[PDB]
C-alpha cells in the first residue's frame, strides 16, 4: 500500500480528537448504526463549520484551501471510530455491512466562499466553495464501478480490483481503464462476481444563476442522486475540481441543501374591521377598486380542500377573471400579487 | 546568451519608472499600487501616454514586440509590492477595424466598438505539473505562451499524466467586437472579430455597450483566423457653439425644417422627430424599477407621402440607427439569435436589429404586414426595454433601450 | 500488484455449496434428454421446502434462498454443471432423422475420439456447446413468502424507480408495461473456427475473431493457416430486446 507521510499520519490522530471532545458528534454515530441494524439512513454526518473552527484555527483554513489532503484523513478517522463503537460482533454478517466508506458534510457560514456561478473565478480552484443556484437539467442515474470482486474456479481464491477515476477521490489518481481481468497471473480464467462487487450511483446536474441576482455542472454520487429537481433553489457545497482551454468546470458536491409574531396576529384578529384594513393594504398605490381588492385576499388565502372517503377530491382555489379597458388597475395589479405571495410564476 | 543580459535592463527600467514618475507633486502609480493591496485586486492601470514622456526607447520597444515586454512588466510589478495584471490605456488615434492589414501583426492597436455577445468562462492552464507512470517523476512546466488561445502543441516530454490538483489556472473569456456603423460604407456588411480576456478582464463588459479596447493584433492556426488579445478595457470652440444655439428661441423651428427637406409641409410630423431623437430622462428608482425614457412614434396613412424617405433621413441623422423592414426581419433579426459553432460545438449568441442599436432609433418599414411570432418580442421591448430569451438552456437578459 | 489486493473471507463457500445442489436434484430431467423440453424452470418454492426437511434432521445447511437473491448470475453456471454431471441416459431411441443439429455433434464427437485414440497409439469441447437447455429461476409465491421472514424482497413486485445501486446482480421483480417489442434475433455463444490446412475447430466463447490457428500442427510446421468461421459449427441462441424505461433481454424459449 501507499506509505503514509508525516503530515498524513498526524491528521488522522488530530481528526479523532475532534470527535472525542464533542459529544454531539459521537452520539450521532451510535444513533445510525443501531437504527440500521434493528430495521434490517445514509452514512453521512453533518459537521458544523463553527465547531471545527473553535477547535483549531489551522485545520479550519486547510479545509477551505486544499481539501484534497484533508478529506481522506477525515473519512478514515470516522470509519475507524465507527468500527470500534459496534460492540455486537456479527459472525455471518461481517463482509457486507463492513465495506462502505463513511462520508462527511459541512454546514455553516463560509465567509468569502459563498460566491455565484457567474462570479466563480479561477482563483478558487481546488477549494471548498458553496455555490448556490437553481437546477435546470438533471441527467439519468447511472451506476459507477469502484471495486470489482473476481473468483478463480481452478484455485478457489478471491481477487479484488479497485478502479480509480477522476470523479472518485479528490487526489489525482492513475486513470485505470474499465477492463475486467479475464485471466490471472498464473493463466487461470477469472469470473467476475457482481453480487460481492461494490457500486455507487452517479448523476450530473446543471446549476444556473438565479435571475433575481444577475452554468456549471455538479456531479452527485452516493445517496446524493435523485434529490435535485429542475426548478428548485438549492445550495450544493463541494470542491471546484477542474478536470479535462479544454478544462471542464466541474464541482464535486458533497451535500445539497434545498412567539412575538404569533401574539401580534391574535391581537389584531379581535377587531371587526380586519377585512377592510387588510384589503386596502395589498395595493396602496392603486386608488379605489375596493371590491376587486377584497377578492384577491380570499384568493391568496384559499379554501378548504375537501377530500371524500372514496377518493373523489374537490377543488378549493378561487379563479378570478378581469375583463375591462387596458391599463385600468390590471397590468400593475398583477405585479403586486407576484411580490406578495410566497409562490407565484409570472406567465 | 545576449538575451539574458538584455532582459535584466528591461525589468530594472520598469521598477525605477514606478518609483520616479510623478504628476503635480503626486505619485499616481505608487498610490494606485499600494491601494490595490487592501482591496486585493491584482491589477494596475498604466497609461500608454505616460511612458512616452519618461523614455522614448521604452515606448518604442513596447509597441514593436509587445509579446515579450508585457510578460516582463508583470514580473517588475510583483517585485515592488513584495501575478499582477497589466492594464494598458491608450489615448491616441482610433484605428478602424477595416484598416487592419498585415502591417499591424504583433503590434499594439486601439479599437472602438460595441460588444456583440459574451461567451462563458474558460480555464487557462499556466503552471502545469506532469507525473510519470513508471518512475513517477513529478516535474513542473511553466507555460509562457502569452500569444495563444487554446493548447497549441502542449509540451509533453508520452507516459506523463497532467496533475489537475497541484496546477494553477486563470480565467479566460471570449468576446465579439463589431465596428462602429458610422464608419461602415453603404452597401457593405460590418464584420466582427473574436477577442480573449484574462484574469479580471472577464465578465466586465455588457453585450450592447460601446467601449474602447486596446489589444495586440495577431493570428493563430485553426489561411488563419485573426484574433486580438484584450489588455485593458476603458474642444472648447465646439462647446460654445452648442450653448449659443440652445439660447436661440427659434431653435424648435430651425431643426424642424432641417430634418428631411424633401418632404414639404407636415409641420406636426417633423416636430415629433426632434423630440424622438432627443428623448426623455432615464430615471432609475431606488427600489429597483426603471422607467421608460424613450419615445415611440407610429406612422400611418396612405402610401405616397414619402414614408420610406422619412425613415432613411432619421438613420442618416441619428448616430446609432439600424434600418429594418417588416417581413425581411424574423426572430433572429429583430431579437438576439442562438447560433451553434460548427468548430467548437458551442452555442454563441448573436446581436440583432434591436440589440446592436442600443440607445438609438430603430426605423422599421411595413409594420402592418408582419407576422404574429415576431410581434411578441416587440411588445416586450417596448414596455420593459429588455429582451428575455430562455432557449437552449441560455437565460440571458439584454437591454433594448431603443 | 502487491499494494491493494485483499483476501475477503466470504462465508459463501462454493466448494461445499455445490454438493447441496446435487443432493436436491436427486421427472423434469428425463424430458430434457428425450428432446421434449428445452426449459428447465427451477422454482424457488421447491428449494424452500427442501430446506425445511433438512433443518429438522439436524444438518447445518447454508441459506440457499439468500444466496440466490444476492447473486443469481453465478448460480446459472453452478446449477447447469450438476445437471450435466448427473444427466441420465435417454430412454427414447435416438434416430438419425430427428434434430439434424445433434447428428453433426454426435459425428464430430466420434471423429474427435478416433483422432485422440490414434494419436495416443502412435506415441505409445466447451460446456456451453453441449448445454441445450435453458435454466430459469421462478420467484417465490405470495403464500410461501409469508412464512419466510428473512428478506422477502424477491417476492414483492418492485418498480423501476425503486431499483437503487444495491440491487445489481440480484433476482428482483419488475412490474410494468412492455413497450417496443423487437424481433427474434439469433445470438451466437460459442464460435468455432475451422482451419483449412490442419482442419481443427477452435472454439471461442462470447461473453474479435480469431485469425491465427492455435493448433500444434500449424505451429510445428511454421504454416499459420487462415481460420474460417463455420456457421454450422457455432451454437446460436435466441435474443429479444424489450422495454418496460428499462431494457429487458429475453434469451431462450
**Domain check: are A125 and A209 in the same one?**
yes
Most distant CA atoms of chain A, gap in Å: 93
C39-43 and C134-138: which strand pairing?
parallel
Give the pairing type, strands A249-256 and A216-221: parallel
Is B187:B334 a contact under the CB 8 Å cutoff? no
| Chains A & B: contacts with CB separation below 8 Å | 60
Q: Do C10 and A95 touch (CB under 8 A)?
A: yes
For residue A245, being part of any structural domain is answered with: yes
For the four alpha carbons of C189, C195, C196 and C198, in that order, the dihedral sign comes to negative
Cell numbers 449568441 correspond to B349
Question: A203 and A139 in contact (C-beta within 8 Å)?
Answer: yes
Residue at A227 is within a domain: yes
Residues in C closer than 8 angstroms to A2, CB to CB, are: 3
**Pairing, β A190-208 against β B394-399:** unpaired
* Binary contact (A118, B122; C-beta < 8 A): no
Taking the Cβ of residue C3 and every Cβ of chain A, the question of whether any pair is shorter than 8 Å is answered with yes
DSSP states of A164-202: --TTTSSS-----------B-TTSPBEEEEEEEEEEEEE
Contacts of B75 (CB under 8 A, 6+ apart): B11
Distance from CA of B170 to the nearest CA of A (A): 5
DSSP-derived secondary structure letter, B104: G
Same domain for A13 and A100, yes or no, is yes
Helix ranges (DSSP H) in chain C: 14-25, 30-33, 44-57, 64-70, 75-85, 100-123, 127-130, 144-147, 216-220
CA distance B315 to B9: 55
Q: Is C165 in CB contact (< 8 Å) with chain A?
A: yes
The verdict on a CB contact (< 8 Å) between A157 and C7 is yes
- Measure the CA–CA gap between B395 and A225, rounded to whole angstroms: 25
Domain shared by A174 and A224, yes or no = no
Q: Do B169 and A122 touch (CB under 8 A)?
A: yes
Residue whose C-alpha cell reads 492455435 in the numeric block? C214
- A99 three-class SS: coil
Distance CA C206, CA C188 (A): 8
Number of Cβ within 10 Å of residue A10's Cβ equals 12
Q: Per-residue DSSP letters for A129-155?
A: EEEEEEEEEE---EEEEEEEEEEETTT
Answer whether A158 touches C (CB < 8 Å): yes
Same domain for A136 and A213: yes
* Closest Cα in chain A, distance from residue B121 (Å): 8
Give the span between the Cα atoms of C196 and A246, in whole angstroms: 52
Which of A211, A227, A258 is the endpoint of a domain? A258
CA distance A46 to A41: 13
Cβ neighbors of C112 (< 8 A, separation 6 or more) are C125
Residue with the three cell numbers 377592510: A276
Domain termination site, one of A200, A216, A241: A200
Q: Which chains form contacts with chain C, at 3 or more CB pairs under 8 Å?
A: A
DSSP string, B111-164: EEEEEEEEEEEEEEEEEEEEEESSS--EEEEE----S-SS-SS------EEEEE
CB A11 within 8 A of CB A18: no
A31: CATH? 3.30.1640.10
**Positive or negative torsion for Cα B376, B380, B386, B388:** negative
| Residue labelled with grid coordinates 430562455 | B390
Tell me the C-alpha distance between A113 and A64, whole Å.
8
Binary contact (A92, C14; C-beta < 8 A): no
Residue A331 forms part of a structural domain: no
Gap between the Cα atoms of B59 and B92, Å rounded: 13
Q: Are residues A149 and A214 in the same domain?
A: no
In a domain, A73, yes or no: yes
Q: Which residue in B98, B113, B110, B97 sits closest to B180, CA to CA?
A: B113
For residue A117, the SS3 value is: coil
Instruction: Mark whether A119 and A246 lie in a shared domain.
Output: yes
Residue A307 lies in a domain: no
What gap in Å lies between CA A291 and CA B105, rounded to an integer? 73
Q: Is residue A40 part of a domain?
A: yes
**Beta pairing class for A128-138 and A103-107:** unpaired
For residues A93 and A125, membership in a common domain is answered with no
Q: Dihedral sign for Cα A215, A220, A226, A228, please.
A: negative
Dihedral, C158, C159, C162, C164 alpha carbons, nearest 10:
80
Indicate whether A23 and A102 sit together in one domain: yes
Containing structural domain, residue A99: 4-113
Q: Name every chain C residue with its beta carbon within 8 A of the beta carbon of A100.
A: none
Hey, is A251 helix, strand or coil? strand
Domain count, chain A: 3
Residue where a domain terminates, one of A113, A129, A163: A113
- Contact list in A for residue C169 (CB cut-off 8 A) is 194-195, 197
Chain-chain contact of A136 with B168 (C-beta, under 8 angstroms): no
What approach was used to elucidate this structure? cryo-EM
Residue for grid cell 441560455: B394
B236: which residues sit within 8 A by CB, 6+ positions away?
Answer: none
Return the residue of C nearest to A155 by Cα. Answer: C15
Question: This structure's resolution (angstroms)?
Answer: 6.1
CB A95 to CB C8 under 8 A? yes
Q: Are residues A10 and A86 in the same domain?
A: yes
For residue B353, what is its C-alpha cell? 436589429
If asked whether residues A130 and A231 sit together in one domain, one would say yes
Q: Does residue A177 fall inside a structural domain? A: yes
Q: Which three cell numbers stand for residue C93?
A: 431411441
Neighbours of chain B (3+ CB pairs under 8 A): A
Residue ranges of chain B whose CB lies within 8 Å of a chain A CB:
120-125, 131, 133, 149-151, 161, 163-166, 168-172, 202-203, 393, 395, 397
Verify that A68 and A125 share a domain, yes or no. no
SS3 assignment, position A83: helix
A120 touching B (Cβ < 8 Å): yes
Which among B107, B99, B90, B77 is positioned nearest to B14, based on CA atoms?
B77
Per CB-CB distance under 8 Å, the chain B contacts of A247 are: 122-123, 125, 169
A174 in contact with B at a CB cutoff of 8 Å?
A: yes
**Does residue A304 sit in helix, strand or coil?**
coil
Q: Are residues A9 and A76 in the same domain?
A: yes
Minimum distance, in Å, between the CA of residue A1 and any CA atom of chain C: 4
Spatial contact of C113 and C106, defined as CB atoms under 8 Å apart? no
Burial class of residue B132 (count of CB atoms within 10 Å of its CB; 0-12, 13-18, 19+):
middle
**Phi and psi, residue A304, nearest 5°:** -120, 120
Amino acid at each position: 500500500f501507499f506509505a503514509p507521510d508525516a503530515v498524513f499520519g498526524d491528521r488522522v490522530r488530530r481528526f479523532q480528537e475532534f470527535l472525542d471532545t464533542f459529544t454531539s458528534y459521537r452520539d450521532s454515530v451510535r444513533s445510525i448504526q443501531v437504527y440500521n441494524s434493528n430495521n434490517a439512513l445514509p452514512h453521512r454526518i453533518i459537521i458544523s463549520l463553527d465547531d471545527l473552527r473553535e477547535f483549531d484555527r489551522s485545520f479550519w483554513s486547510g479545509i477551505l484551501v486544499e481539501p484534497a489532503y484533508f478529506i481522506p484523513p477525515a473519512e478514515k478517522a470516522l470509519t475507524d471510530l465507527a468500527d470500534s463503537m459496534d460492540d455486537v460482533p456479527h459472525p455471518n454478517a461481517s463482509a457486507v455491512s463492513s465495506r462502505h466508506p463513511w462520508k462527511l458534510s459541512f454546514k455553516g457560514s463560509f465567509g468569502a466562499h459563498a460566491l455565484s456561478p457567474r462570479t466563480l473565478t479561477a482563483q478558487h480552484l481546488n477549494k471548498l466553495v458553496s455555490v448556490e443556484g437553481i437546477v435546470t437539467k438533471t441527467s439519468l442515474v447511472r451506476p459507477k464501478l469502484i471495486r470489482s470482486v473476481h473468483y478463480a474456479a481452478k484455485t478457489g481464491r478471491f481477487h479484488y480490483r479497485d478502479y480509480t477515476d477522476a470523479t472518485t477521490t479528490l487526489t489525482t489518481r492513475i486513470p485505470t481503464p474499465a477492463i475486467y481481468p479475464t485471466e490471472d497471473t498464473e493463466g487461470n480464467k477469472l469470473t467476475t462476481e457482481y453480487g460481492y462487487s461494490t457500486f455507487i450511483d452517479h448523476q450530473r446536474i446543471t446549476v444556473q444563476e438565479m435571475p433575481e441576482m444577475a452554468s456549471i455542472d455538479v456531479i452527485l454520487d452516493d445517496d446524493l442522486v435523485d434529490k435535485t429537481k429542475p426548478g428548485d433553489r438549492v445550495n450544493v457545497v463541494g470542491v471546484f475540481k477542474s478536470l479535462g482551454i479544454g478544462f471542464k468546470t466541474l464541482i464535486l458536491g458533497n451535500t445539497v441543501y434545498p412567539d412575538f409574531d404569533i401574539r401580534n396576529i391574535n391581537k389584531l384578529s379581535k377587531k371587526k374591521d380586519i377585512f377592510d384594513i387588510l384589503s386596502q393594504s395589498l395595493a396602496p398605490s392603486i386608488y379605489g377598486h375596493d371590491h376587486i381588492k377584497k377578492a384577491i385576499l380570499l384568493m391568496l388565502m384559499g379554501g378548504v380542500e375537501k377530500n371524500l372517503e372514496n377518493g373523489s377530491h374537490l377543488r378549493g382555489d378561487i379563479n378570478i377573471l378581469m375583463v375591462g379597458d387596458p391599463s385600468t388597475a390590471k397590468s400593475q395589479l398583477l405585479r403586486f400579487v407576484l411580490n406578495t405571495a410566497s409562490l407565484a410564476i409570472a406567465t | 546568451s545576449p538575451n539574458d543580459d538584455d532582459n535584466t535592463e528591461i525589468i530594472k527600467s520598469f521598477k525605477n519608472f514606478i518609483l520616479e514618475f510623478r504628476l503635480d507633486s503626486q505619485f499616481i502609480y505608487r498610490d494606485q499600487l499600494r491601494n490595490n493591496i487592501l482591496v486585493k485586486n491584482y491589477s494596475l492601470t498604466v497609461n500608454m501616454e505616460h511612458l512616452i514622456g519618461y523614455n522614448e526607447d521604452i515606448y518604442k520597444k513596447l509597441s514593436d514586440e509587445p509579446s515579450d515586454i508585457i510578460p516582463l512588466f508583470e514580473t517588475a510589478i510583483t517585485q515592488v509590492a513584495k501575478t499582477f495584471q497589466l492594464i494598458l490605456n491608450s489615448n491616441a488615434n482610433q484605428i478602424p477595424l477595416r484598416d487592419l492589414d498585415s502591417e499591424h501583426v504583433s503590434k499594439i492597436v486601439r479599437l472602438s466598438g460595441i460588444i456583440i455577445s459574451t461567451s462563458v468562462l474558460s480555464s487557462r492552464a499556466t503552471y502545469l505539473s506532469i507525473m510519470c507512470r513508471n518512475c513517477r517523476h513529478t516535474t513542473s512546466i511553466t507555460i509562457n505562451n502569452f500569444n495563444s488561445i487554446t493548447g497549441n502543441t502542449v509540451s509533453l516530454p508520452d507516459p506523463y499524466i497532467i496533475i489537475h490538483e497541484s496546477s494553477k489556472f486563470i480565467d479566460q473569456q471570449f468576446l465579439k467586437l463589431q465596428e462602429i456603423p458610422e464608419l461602415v460604407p453603404v452597401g457593405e456588411m460590418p464584420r466582427n472579430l473574436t477577442m480573449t480576456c484574462d484574469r479580471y478582464l472577464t465578465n466586465k463588459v455588457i453585450p450592447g455597450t460601446r467601449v474602447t479596447i486596446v489589444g495586440i493584433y495577431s493570428i493563430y492556426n485553426s489561411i488563419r483566423t485573426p484574433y486580438i488579445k484584450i489588455l485593458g478595457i476603458q474642444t472648447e470652440e465646439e462647446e460654445e457653439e452648442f450653448l449659443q444655439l440652445s439660447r436661440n428661441p427659434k431653435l424648435y423651428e430651425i431643426l424642424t425644417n432641417s430634418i428631411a427637406p424633401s418632404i414639404f409641409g407636415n409641420e406636426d410630423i417633423k416636430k415629433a422627430i426632434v423630440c424622438l431623437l432627443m428623448g426623455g430622462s432615464k430615471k432609475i428608482l431606488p427600489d429597483g424599477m426603471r422607467l421608460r425614457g424613450d419615445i415611440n412614434v407610429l406612422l400611418l396613412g396612405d402610401p405616397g407621402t414619402a414614408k420610406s424617405q422619412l425613415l432613411k433621413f432619421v438613420e442618416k441623422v441619428s448616430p446609432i440607427a439600424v434600418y429594418t423592414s417588416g417581413k425581411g426581419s424574423s426572430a433572429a433579426g429583430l431579437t438576439a439569435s442562438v447560433q451553434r459553432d460548427p468548430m467548437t460545438r458551442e452555442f454563441y449568441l448573436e446581436g440583432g436589429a434591436m440589440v446592436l442599436a442600443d440607445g438609438g432609433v430603430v426605423c422599421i418599414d411595413e409594420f402592418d404586414k408582419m407576422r404574429d411570432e415576431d410581434r411578441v418580442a416587440i411588445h416586450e421591448a417596448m414596455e420593459q426595454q429588455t429582451i428575455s430569451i430562455a432557449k437552449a438552456g441560455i437565460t440571458t437578459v439584454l437591454n433594448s433601450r431603443t | 500488484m502487491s499494494a491493494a489486493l485483499p483476501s475477503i473471507q466470504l462465508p459463501v463457500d462454493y466448494n461445499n455449496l455445490f454438493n447441496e445442489i446435487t443432493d436436491f436434484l436427486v421427472a423434469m430431467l428425463q424430458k430434457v434428454a428425450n428432446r421434449e423440453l428445452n426449459s428447465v424452470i427451477i422454482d424457488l418454492d421447491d428449494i424452500l421446502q427442501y430446506q425445511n426437511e433438512k433443518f429438522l434432521q439436524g444438518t447445518q445447511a447454508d441459506d440457499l434462498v439468500s444466496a440466490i437473491q444476492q447473486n443469481a448470475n453465478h448460480f446459472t453456471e453452478l446449477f447447469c454443471r450438476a445437471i450435466d454431471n448427473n444427466m441420465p441416459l435417454p430412454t427414447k431411441e435416438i434416430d438419425y432423422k430427428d434434430d439434424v443439429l445433434d447428428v453433426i455433434l454426435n459425428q464430430r464427437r466420434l471423429r474427435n475420439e478416433r483422432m485422440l485414440s490414434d494419436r495416443t497409439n502412435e506415441i505409445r469441447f466447451p460446456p456451453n456447446l453441449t448445454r441445450r437447455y435453458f435454466l430459469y429461476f421462478k420467484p417465490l409465491s405470495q403464500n410461501c413468502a409469508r412464512r419466510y421472514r428473512k428478506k422477502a424482497i424477491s417476492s414483492k413486485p418492485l418498480s423501476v424507480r425503486q431499483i437503487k445501486g444495491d440491487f445489481l446482480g440480484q433476482l428482483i421483480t419488475v412490474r410494468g408495461i412492455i413497450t417496443r417489442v423487437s424481433d427474434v434475433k439469433p445470438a451466437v455463444e460459442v464460435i468455432a473456427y475451422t482451419c483449412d490446412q490442419c482442419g481443427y475447430e477452435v472454439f471461442q466463447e462470447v461473453n474479435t475473431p480469431l485469425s491465427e490457428c492455435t493448433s500444434e500442427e500449424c505451429s510445428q510446421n511454421q504454416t499459420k493457416g487462415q481460420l474460417f468461421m463455420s456457421t454450422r459449427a457455432s451454437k446460436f441462441s435466441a435474443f429479444q430486446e424489450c422495454k418496460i424505461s428499462l431494457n429487458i433481454h429475453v434469451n431462450g424459449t
